[PDB]
Write a protein that binds this ligand. Structure first.
Ligand code: GTP
Ligand code: MG
Ligand code: ZN
Lengths: 223, 54, 852, 216, 456
């Protein structure tokens, strides 16, 4: 790779994509050898496919390296963000049961050998937030029941797709409560033009068949 | 507590209403080094004095 | 020439005439402690010879300290040359090449560079502070560099306007300062012919701020000018030093009449000076007109309207006139340098004085071979091209004349560190402006353009097609060791070449700077201290390379040693499986490393004298004493290499054949070191056995050298290894009250207070202590900010000491960002410096052993 | 017009004594180490606060230390920590401890300590060995007495008659070190608005043991 | 004496040797006495005991180095020159040299060269590496190559080596590194079919003062103009020598007929009266031009039945109608309008057209997508000259030899270049590191941005 693309200034680190969602010690650490290996692998793969038929672009790709310097193996698949950490490498610690962590264990000897930590992709977070924004904007002259039905459908979809990742993600919970509060504020504004104080939650959270809106909750509401 | 605060400093370094009174939260000079807490006020040979004070 | 120049009392034509006559030249270096008046003295001299230039009333002009950083910080950072034509008390004129040096203990490399081309030293001592750290170190350095030293006691007005001591006590203070200087000189120089005393003319008294400068001779000349019937020479011979005047008989006696008479000095020099200063600053409106009438000084009403400080400067200037005492001192007690050439060649020239060129240069004639020597490199404001500043020891430099520049690595056998260049222009550098000339004779300082490319630090310029048997002058021997270390990187890697160019330029500029690239591609810079490195970074970031640079946190450079002989005798074999070597290691005796470093011994010595010294001093049997082979990484290193192999087991001729290869391997191994790849200090390596292959193509070359290094590493590792730390020697100058605060601050940082004493005649105290260099960072600012500025400290590298812990211990566990306790500092430092260098995670004592 | 003035030294001394209660009796600027306009400019530029100093909005958009992505340079596993690098070290040595020092000012280095022995008793001689001074613990090519050198009758010290000190010598020496404008003997006339009385008071370190409101 | 019998000579591996970068010691950064280790291709300070090269030799067992300035080999640690004629290839690749016969026969070469690896290529048609953003500079440099006169002048170092330069001249780096790059490009015995312009571009950024960086792409035409002027000035030795190689090859002369229009918002009487003022009459300000700046008509703003493709087109001669004595361009400076006519007076042997593709409208820059319809092998410019100069000029037919094309949006721009390879007649399309063969009839179907034509 370097014979094809000589690099005298060690400039192979300027444009390297990294998963900013994780902490610094959980991201990929840019060593000379690992950065060069990633760039070389990408170059080798991109050589195979002709430019005419289809192209593989570095800006939209991500290549992660696990080696003697980097102990984490990161990737993003199907809207998830998975990070695999071996037990032998840089664990040195006992583990309890957290919700978002899968205990990858060897299949023949049945031994815990690695842990996979999961998160919800920032792209999926943004898509959900934009869905809520669309619901609110297009709300316009629509009905409270329809607004609540849209909210319930969106929340059910997100929560049934990203099951453990939502719990593992500390930003998605805040986003969920923010959007829920926005929806409730929309209902209250429709009710009256002046904001009340300590509005009761029964109207929102009572089932539809019993006269309520049947809202679905994902926060910590104290009656 | 001072040692924990020092380690915290190291880790942090490396890894409408009309208010006429400034808030105490604006205060600086809250240090952990005793050399900067008690700073050995100057003795001008015992013959110079600070202005204003009696 | 013909370029434009400022108006001068003398003329450039007369200056050009003077340069030819090498009997009326004087190469002087102004040196001394920080903030002791050197720059203002030089500026007052410039004011004298250049009427247009002046020093502002409220602000002090310098005319040195030209740099922007110097102007902002207030501390001289770079030495500055000046060339003036000063008049002597007798009315004769001489040419003075004055190199004004900085004072801060961090910039002693500039002082050494000035000394190399100077012939005399003028030591500036403050009248209040007295002798200080840098004055002591500079006296040592000068007497070791074999220069003639004279003293100027500056700031004598602090005894009158700040301490307001009585005249007798002021005299006692001055006498005490002289005594301290004499004691230091006698300590550091065996010869006793060099004694400083105002009676002889080696000491002058100056107050640079108020333009006062005089010697006993000059003040007696003032007395004679007022009354024309006295020999000022005899008067000066009698003034100083316990000579009481008797007016009834008008004679001087060693016995005091009336038991209350003041000494002749206190009566004639000091007391009237007290009177003049007191009258100017206390009674400017009542009796000053009468006092000026008595003195004969007449000054205009607009002039006497001034404020007290400018008025004092003006009155003192009118009363005293020119700085003739300084010129008298320098002329009488500094070589010509036609006279002083011989010691200069003897000490510096590598080819020896006895050489034919040695004699030709000791003659020091303008008509002869060209043997210029360049030690400084000054950059233009644009920062593109450097001009080489040096001295001409023979011949005559001509503009446009091709020359041959020889660098430091040049030797008469390897004639590749030379290059043929073409000198562009010549300058006679006055501080702030350069008088361009077309030729320069032997015995003068010169700026040269067009010879900067093939030289980095120091070089010698000769003529091609002549002086085939030419050898370089010795490279500068520095007064200290650069220890503090930083790493550098560009912010945007696309701009690396700019950073590399800036690194090269700063390496050229700073004489003792060392820039290098580590195995892991890390650009490291070695500097003396915090302010040194700050100035270096400012220059690298603003002047030379115009990019933005990330700097790592400062760290120091360690060494590696052993504390007991090797557990087992170790060995290695060449890849040919012949040529086996077998060594042992042990620690040297106390002080032997210091002797080797300070040149008490020289491997160049005849084996007779070498063995004699080693036997008589360090209780070495003559058999071993005559078995020395090498002296560590350099010809003068703190490690020794001996061979104990008896001739009965091996062939001495064969060992002599492979001696050079073994010595090269030993020196390389000592330079690198196994623990963390750093110098090995204070170790004795004894070759206990050696089986050598018979054929030269079976031995030598790439066979023995790596094997010798591997054996050295194995022996060192087998011997109980330890790391060695550098220790700074701190000297704080604090009020009598803040001593306890200084104690607290030092105790916080592993410091140890050796002493704390008062300054006689002053209300201040000096506290001397030792501080680990690694912990020294930020210490001075800590002290100053805790004391509210009343305490100031200067620190300089002193010696190496063993780090508390044991390095080769794997039980210890180091957290990433925690200050480790004392017992495993060694292990922490070892592993982290290994990581920095980029070597393996750790080292095993069997790593370099051949068996595993 | 009341434009310019030129006073006598006794007048200046009396005025200085009267104004004494408004002046801090400082002889040097060492007091203001890392507490002067240049240090404050540097702190503002680097977006840091001297313990007792002001605090502004970031001059340039601050660089987040959680953004950098663990290169070889900033590898925390090679650092050796002995003492935390306080803001004061960076303010004192801006170019050695900071990355990207922009619009940073170099701070004046040490100025030699002024050792002036203020006189408390006006009855003493002007030139006097005050007890504050550390004592000089006492202990030569001299020509013989039998020598014949003889001075002429006319010759004697330059100002034998003039007294060494007068009743207004210590006053002048003190005025030499009095703060502006009491070290002058002439000048121009300012405006009552243009004369601030407590600028020197609030430029100093705050006295110890004061309430938070006055500190702020 | 052991020379010619070095036992280690096999260990050399030409696969790693890369002589395209700065010659400085890898451990001291000094330029003096630089030796390249032929086993691993790293630079060190040279020779002698205790030097970096010697220490590296004993430490790694790399026992063969080459002095980068004297082109002599040496074996270490035991120093002695190596005299073997099979190593001449390394020296030639390190510092190519072209003799007069080689330069003369340079063009008439129809047989491919083969790099050290099994890669065939042709001299001159050689890719230029693309550091982050280099496409525009690579295109301009490639077009300046393939110009026989300028290339023939810069292939011989002694041509410009001895021309004087002031003390602090940093503009001569441009000329000397351009010569180095030209020699590297036209080297027929290389080790790789591509070369790196890193050094030349570093010099370019240094001289341009951070204009035309390598991490941001600028205007190809702006770079071309600045580079031509920089080379002209630099070759001008301690003066403006009226005739440098650049002026001899590219610079032509035109006669510019400015007629200041009286005023737009004036009455007819005043407008026709102002004609007699002679301030609004034709003048002649004959000057010199390095490159004509042809201007495209704006997009039609509406599609049409014929040439069903939405893409508009123009004839090259319609574009060239300006610069005849008849047509009039309408210059509009603030407060004033000029009717400018032009008349070519001296046509250079190598004529450069720069089509003003990009244009800044009220809100952003726009790339006019018009395609000029030009022939390749013939264009007769006789008719655009005065009869006073047609007699002087014998040859006026021009052939397209180089064409630089810009593709993509004004932001995500990219550059390619179609170059005619003499010796053969084939047209090669070069992108940064990709060389393809392109049919002559497909050249005109792209958005021409710069053209270099040869007078024959
Ligand atoms: N009282 C008094 N102060 C002086 C006198 N001469 C110089 N100074 C002060 O001493 C300080 C040092 O000034 P310089 O002489 O320029 O400093 P330097 O001698 O070049 O020493 P470096 O800064 O290390 O180069 C300045 O603040 C001066 O005002 C003097 O004769 N009397
Ligand atoms: Mg100075
Ligand atoms: Zn190698």
């Amino acid at each position: 790779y370097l014979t094809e693309h000589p690099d005298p200034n060690n400039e192979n680190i300027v444009g390297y994509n990294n998963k900013k969602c994780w902490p610094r010690d959980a991201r990929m650490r840019l060593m000379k050898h690992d950065v060069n290996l990633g760039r070389a692998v990408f170059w080798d793969i991109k050589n195979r496919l002709p430019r005419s038929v289809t192209t593989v672009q570095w800006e939209n790709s991500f290549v992660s390296v696990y080696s003697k310097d980097n102990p984490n193996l990161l990737f993003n698949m199907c809207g998830f963000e998975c990070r695999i950490l071996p037990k032998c490498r840089t664990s040195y610690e006992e583990f309890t049961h957290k919700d978002g962590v899968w205990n990858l264990q060897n299949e023949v000897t049945k031994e815990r050998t690695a842990q996979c930590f999961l998160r919800v992709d920032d792209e999926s977070m943004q898509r959900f937030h934009n869905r809520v924004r669309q619901i609110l904007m297009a709300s316009g002259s629509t009905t409270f029941t329809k607004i609540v039905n849209k909210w319930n459908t969106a929340l059910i979809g997100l929560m049934t797709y990203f099951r453990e990742a939502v719990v593992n993600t500390q930003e998605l919970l805040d986003l969920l409560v923010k959007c829920e509060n926005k929806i409730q504020t929309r209902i209250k504004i429709g009710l009256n033009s002046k904001m009340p104080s300590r509005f009761p939650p029964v109207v929102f959270y009572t089932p539809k068949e019993l006269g309520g809106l049947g809202m679905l909750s994902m926060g910590h509401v104290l009656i | 507590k001072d040692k924990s605060k020092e380690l915290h400093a190291i880790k942090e370094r490396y890894l409408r209403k009309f208010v006429f009174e400034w808030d105490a939260s604006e205060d600086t000079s809250i240090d952990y080094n005793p050399l900067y807490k008690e700073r050995h006020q100057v003795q001008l040979l015992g013959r110079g004095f600070i202005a204003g004070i009696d | 020439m013909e370029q434009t120049l400022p108006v001068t009392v003398y003329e450039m034509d007369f200056l050009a005439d003077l340069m030819d006559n090498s009997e009326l030249i004087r190469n002087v270096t102004l040196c001394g402690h920080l903030h002791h008046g050197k720059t203002c003295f030089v500026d007052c001299l410039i004011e004298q010879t250049h009427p247009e230039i002046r020093k502002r009333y409220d602000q002090d002009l310098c005319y040195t300290d030209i740099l922007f950083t110097e102007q902002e910080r207030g501390v001289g950072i770079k030495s500055t040359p000046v060339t003036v034509v000063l008049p002597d008390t007798k009315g004769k004129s001489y040419l003075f090449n004055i190199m004004d040096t900085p004072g801060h203990v961090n910039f002693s490399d500039e002082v050494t560079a000035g000394l190399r081309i100077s012939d005399g030293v003028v030591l500036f001592i403050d009248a209040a502070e007295g002798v200080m750290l840098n004055t002591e170190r500079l006296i040592k350095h000068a007497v070791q560099e074999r220069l003639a030293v004279t003293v100027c006691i500056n700031k004598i007005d602090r005894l009158i306007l700040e301490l307001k001591l009585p005249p007798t006590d002021a005299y006692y203070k001055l006498r005490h300062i002289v005594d301290e200087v004499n004691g230091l000189i006698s300590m550091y120089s065996t010869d006793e012919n060099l004694i400083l005393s105002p009676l002889l003319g080696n000491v002058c008294f100056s107050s640079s701020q108020y333009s006062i400068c005089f010697t006993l001779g000059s003040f007696a000349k003032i007395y004679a000018d007022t009354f024309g019937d006295i020999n000022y020479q005899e008067f000066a011979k009698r003034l100083w030093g316990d000579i009481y005047f008797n007016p009834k008989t008008r004679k001087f006696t060693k016995k005091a009449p009336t038991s209350s008479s003041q000494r002749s000095f206190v009566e004639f020099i000091l007391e009237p000076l007290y009177k003049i200063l007191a009258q100017v600053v206390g009674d400017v409106d009542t009796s000053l007109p009468r006092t000026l009438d008595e003195l004969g000084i007449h000054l205009t009403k607009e002039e006497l309207k001034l404020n007290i400080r400018p008025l004092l400067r003006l009155v003192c200037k009118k009363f005293f006139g020119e700085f003739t005492g300084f010129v008298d001192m320098c002329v009488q007690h500094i070589p010509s340098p036609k006279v002083g050439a011989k010691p200069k060649i003897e000490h510096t020239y590598t080819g020896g004085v006895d050489s034919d060129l040695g004699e030709a240069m000791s003659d020091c004639d303008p008509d002869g071979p060209l043997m210029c020597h360049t030690t400084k490199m000054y950059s233009t404001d644009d920062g593109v091209q450097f001009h080489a500043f040096g001295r001409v020891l023979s011949g005559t430099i001509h503009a446009g004349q091709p020359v041959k520049v020889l660098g430091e690595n040049y030797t008469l056998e390897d004639e590749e560190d030379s290059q043929i260049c073409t000198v562009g222009r010549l300058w006679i550098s006055v501080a702030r402006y350069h008088i361009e000339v077309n030729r320069v004779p032997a015995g003068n300082w010169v700026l040269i353009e067009g010879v900067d490319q093939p030289i980095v630090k120091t070089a010698t310029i000769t003529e091609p097609r002549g002086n085939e048997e030419a050898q370089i002058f010795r490279p500068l021997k520095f007064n200290t060791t650069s220890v503090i270390k930083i790493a550098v990187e560009p912010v945007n890697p696309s701009e690396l070449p700019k950073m590399l160019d800036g690194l090269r330029k700063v390496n050229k500029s700073y004489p003792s700077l060392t820039t290098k690239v580590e195995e892991s591609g890390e650009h490291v810079i070695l500097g003396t201290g915090e302010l040194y490195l700050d100035c270096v970074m400012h220059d690298l970031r603003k002047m030379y390379s115009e990019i933005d640079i990330k700097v790592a946190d400062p760290v120091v450079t360690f060494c590696e040693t052993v504390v007991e002989t090797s557990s087992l005798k170790c060995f290695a074999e060449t890849p040919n499986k012949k040529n086996k070597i077998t060594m042992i290691a042990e620690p040297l005796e106390k002080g032997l490393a210091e002797d080797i470093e300070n040149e008490v011994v020289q491997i160049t010595w005849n084996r007779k004298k070498l063995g004699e010294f080693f036997q008589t001093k360090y209780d070495w049997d003559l058999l071993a004493a005559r078995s020395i082979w090498a002296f560590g990484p350099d010809a003068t290193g703190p490690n020794i290499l001996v061979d104990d192999t008896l001739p009965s087991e091996v062939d001495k001729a064969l060992l002599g054949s492979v001696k050079d290869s073994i010595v090269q391997g030993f020196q390389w191994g000592t330079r690198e070191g196994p623990l963390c790849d750093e110098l090995i200090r204070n170790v004795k390596f004894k070759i206990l056995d050696a089986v050598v292959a018979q054929e030269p193509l079976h031995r030598g070359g790439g066979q023995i050298i790596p094997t010798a290094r591997r054996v050295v590493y194995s022996a060192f590792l087998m011997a109980t290894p330890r790391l060695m730390e550098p220790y700074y020697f701190v000297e704080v100058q604090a009020p009598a009250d803040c001593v306890s605060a200084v104690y607290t601050v030092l105790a916080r940082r592993r410091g140890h207070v050796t002493q704390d004493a008062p300054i006689p005649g002053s209300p201040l105290y000096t506290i001397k202590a030792f501080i680990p260099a690694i912990d020294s960072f930020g210490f001075e600012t800590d002290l100053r900010t805790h004391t509210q500025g009343q305490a100031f400290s200067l620190s300089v590298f002193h010696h190496w000491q063993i780090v508390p812990g044991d390095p080769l211990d794997k039980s210890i566990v180091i957290r990433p960002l925690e200050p480790q306790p004392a017992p495993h500092l060694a292990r922490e430092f070892m592993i982290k410096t290994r990581r920095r260098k980029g070597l393996s995670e750790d080292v095993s004592i069997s790593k370099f052993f051949d068996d595993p | 017009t009341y434009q310019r003035w030129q006073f006598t030294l006794p007048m200046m001394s009396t005025l200085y004594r009267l104004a004494n209660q408004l002046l801090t009796d400082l002889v040097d600027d060492n007091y203001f180490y890392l507490f002067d306009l240049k240090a404050f400019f540097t702190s503002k530029a680097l977006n840091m606060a001297i313990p007792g100093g002001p605090k502004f909005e970031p001059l340039v958009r601050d660089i987040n230390l959680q953004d950098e992505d663990w290169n070889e340079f900033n590898d925390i596993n090679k650092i050796i920590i002995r003492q935390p690098i306080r803001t004061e070290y960076k303010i004192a040595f801006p170019y050695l401890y900071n990355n990207l020092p922009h619009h940073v000012h170099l701070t004046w280095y040490h100025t030699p300590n002024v050792v002036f022995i203020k006189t408390e008793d006006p009855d003493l001689p002007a030139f006097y060995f005050d007890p504050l001074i550390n004592p000089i613990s006492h202990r030569e090519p001299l020509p013989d007495d039998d020598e014949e050198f003889e001075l002429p009758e006319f010759v004697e010290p330059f100002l034998k008659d003039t007294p060494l000190y007068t009743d207004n010598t210590a006053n002048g020496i003190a005025l030499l070190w009095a703060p502006r404008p009491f070290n002058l003997r002439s000048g121009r006339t300012r405006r009552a608005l243009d004369i601030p009385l407590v600028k020197n008071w609030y430029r100093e370190h705050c006295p110890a043991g004061q309430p938070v409101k006055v500190r702020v | 004496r052991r020379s010619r019998h070095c036992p280690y000579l096999d260990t050399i591996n030409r696969s790693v040797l890369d002589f395209d970068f700065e010659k400085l010691c890898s451990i001291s950064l000094s330029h003096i006495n630089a030796y390249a280790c032929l086993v691993c291709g790293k630079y060190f300070q040279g020779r002698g005991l205790k030097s970096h090269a010697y220490i590296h030799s004993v430490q790694f067992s790399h026992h063969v180095f080459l002095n980068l300035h004297t082109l002599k080999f040496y074996c270490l640690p035991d120093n002695y020159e190596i005299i073997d004629s099979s190593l001449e290839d390394i020296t030639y690749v390190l510092k190519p040299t072209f003799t007069k016969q080689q330069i003369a026969n340079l063009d008439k070469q129809a047989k491919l060269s083969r790099a050290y690896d099994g890669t065939t290529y042709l001299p001159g048609i050689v890719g230029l590496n693309n550091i982050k953003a280099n496409d525009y500079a690579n295109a301009v440099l490639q077009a300046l190559s393939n110009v026989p006169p300028l290339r023939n002048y810069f292939l011989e170092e002694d041509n410009y080596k001895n021309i004087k330069r002031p003390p602090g001249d940093i503009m001569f780096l441009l000329v000397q590194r351009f010569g180095e790059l030209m020699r590297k490009l036209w080297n027929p015995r290389n080790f790789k079919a591509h070369v790196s312009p890193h050094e030349m571009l570093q010099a370019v950024v240094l001289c341009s003062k951070k204009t035309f960086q390598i991490t941001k792409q600028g205007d190809g035409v702006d770079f071309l103009s600045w580079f031509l002027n920089a080379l002209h000035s630099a070759l001008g030795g301690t003066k403006k020598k009226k005739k440098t190689i650049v002026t001899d090859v590219f610079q032509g002369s035109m006669r510019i007929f400015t007629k200041k229009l009286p005023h737009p918002d004036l009455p007819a009487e005043e407008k026709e009266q102002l004609l007699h003022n002679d301030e609004y009459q034709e003048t002649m300000v004959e000057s010199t031009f390095m490159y004509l700046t042809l201007d495209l008509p704006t997009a039609p703003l509406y599609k049409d039945e014929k040439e069903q493709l939405i893409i508009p087109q123009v004839p090259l001669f319609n574009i060239l109608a300006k610069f005849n004595g008849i047509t009039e361009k309408e210059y509009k400076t603030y407060k004033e309008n000029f009717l400018k006519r032009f008349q070519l007076t001296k046509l250079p042997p190598y004529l450069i057209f720069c089509i003003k593709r990009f244009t800044k409208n009220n809100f952003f820059v726009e790339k006019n997508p018009t395609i000029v319809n030009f022939p390749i092998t013939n264009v007769d410019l006789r008719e655009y000259l005065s009869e006073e100069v047609q007699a002087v000029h014998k040859n006026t037919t021009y052939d397209l030899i180089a064409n630089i094309v810009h593709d993509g949006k004004p932001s995500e721009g990219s550059y390619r270049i179609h170059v005619l390879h003499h010796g053969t007649g084939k047209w090669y399309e070069l992108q940064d590191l990709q060389v393809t063969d392109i049919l002559p009839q497909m050249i005109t179907l792209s958005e021409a941005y710069i053209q270099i034509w040869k007078r024959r």
